[PDB]
Structure 1
């Protein structure tokens, strides 16, 4: 997250922190995700496509820091890694960049909701907020495009939804953006998602309910003028989600 503010898991208790085991035992951060039911986390396919083996991954819930434990956190193995069959990557844009992880503990249990662990509602189909609506994004991704490290403390910021028509201008993304994607950005291009925020939540208030409107997917640079963040449009994938859960 470029700009924005530091936060803790209580302000985004559906946030899932996804790591991968190596090859000798080191564990490194991969991507964010969102808890949509006790046993299911939703994220982006591009996070897993190069290492599509479920046994390689670890999911934490209730975690506010990257490389230290948070009191009350839960750790899970991945019982099921479901990547979207129609995924594709061109140079910049990822199509159908959506993935489901079924989580199970060594004790074989799903998530127990607590003060630091809650689910997030999915939207109703084809129902998103209007352009210019302010939404929030959360993650452990870079604080600057040039950074080598990820922040140790969770961050969040606010971005405004951009119209498909605006996003498709050549100056923006041209045809790279489809109707199954959403664009969002700061009016000053001052704050944004970045590398390491992939898979995490774009949350909007719809009908007075916090709703998983988007999943961080891609962008050209971070917080660059005319280059919004691009998000998987969750309201266009509900059958896929429902079928696979």
Structure 2
């Protein structure tokens, strides 16, 4: 997150922290996620597409710091790693950038909600806030483009939804942005998602409900003028989600 504030998990209880274990015993941070039900975390496919083996991953819930423990945190294995069949990647865009991780602790259980661990509601079919709506992003991503390490402490910021018309101008993203995507940005271009924020929630208040409107997906650089953060438009993937969170 470029700009914004540091935060703690109690303010983003659905936030999931996703890491990968390597040969040798080292763990690196991969991407953020969001708990949508006790056994299910939603994230972005581009996060896993190169290393699709579900045994390499660790998922934390109730976690505020990158490399240290938080009181109340809970650690999960990935029982099932589902990537989108039609996922793809051009120069800038990822298409169908959406993944499902089925989580279970070492004792075979799903998440237990607590003050620091909660689910976030999905949106209803094609029901999005209007443009100019303020929404929040959360992540462990870079605080500056020149950074080579991620912050140790969770951050959040508030961005505004940008119209498809605005986002589809030649000098923005032209036709690279589709209807299955949403743009969001700071009107003064000082706060943004960045590398390492991939997979995390774009949360908007929808009809009085905190709603998972977007998933951090792509963009050109970080807080660049005329270059918004691009997000998977969750409301357009409800059937995909519904079908893979079953049997």
> In the alignment, what sits opposite 2:193?
193
Rounded to whole Å, the distance in 2 between the matches of 1:227 and 1:166 is 10
Per-residue CA deviation, residues 175-226 of structure 1 (Å, 9 max, x unaligned), is 1100000000000000000000000000000111000000000010000000
Rounded to whole Å, the distance in 2 between the matches of 1:91 and 1:43 is 21
Determine helix, strand or coil for the equivalent of 1:212. strand
Rounded to whole Å, the distance in 1 between the matches of 2:146 and 2:238 is 36
Per-residue CA deviation, residues 39-92 of structure 1 (Å, 9 max, x unaligned), is 000000000001000000000000000000001100000000000000000011
* Counterparts of residues 84-163 of structure 1 (less than 5 Å): 84-163=84-163
Could you state the TM-score of these two structures normalised by the residue count of structure 2? 0.99
Per-residue CA deviation, residues 71-119 of structure 1 (Å, 9 max, x unaligned), is 1100000000000000000011000000000001110000000000000
Could you state the TM-score of these two structures normalised by the residue count of structure 1? 1.00
Task: Give the aligned CA root-mean-square deviation in angstroms.
Answer: 0.3
Rounded to whole Å, the distance in 1 between the matches of 2:5 and 2:87 is 32
Aligned residues: 245
Moved over 3 A (4+): none
Determine helix, strand or coil for the equivalent of 1:193. coil
Rounded to whole Å, the distance in 2 between the matches of 1:109 and 1:82 is 19
Q: Which runs of 5+ in 1 are unaligned?
A: none
Rounded to whole Å, the distance in 2 between the matches of 1:170 and 1:10 is 40
Determine helix, strand or coil for the equivalent of 2:152. coil
Determine helix, strand or coil for the equivalent of 2:75. strand
Rounded to whole Å, the distance in 1 between the matches of 2:169 and 2:111 is 42
1:33 CA displacement: 0.1
Answer yes or no: is 1:76 the counterpart of 2:68. no
Rounded to whole Å, the distance in 2 between the matches of 1:145 and 1:188 is 17
1:23 CA displacement: 1.0
Rounded to whole Å, the distance in 1 between the matches of 2:39 and 2:127 is 25
Rounded to whole Å, the distance in 1 between the matches of 2:23 and 2:173 is 38
Determine helix, strand or coil for the equivalent of 2:19. strand
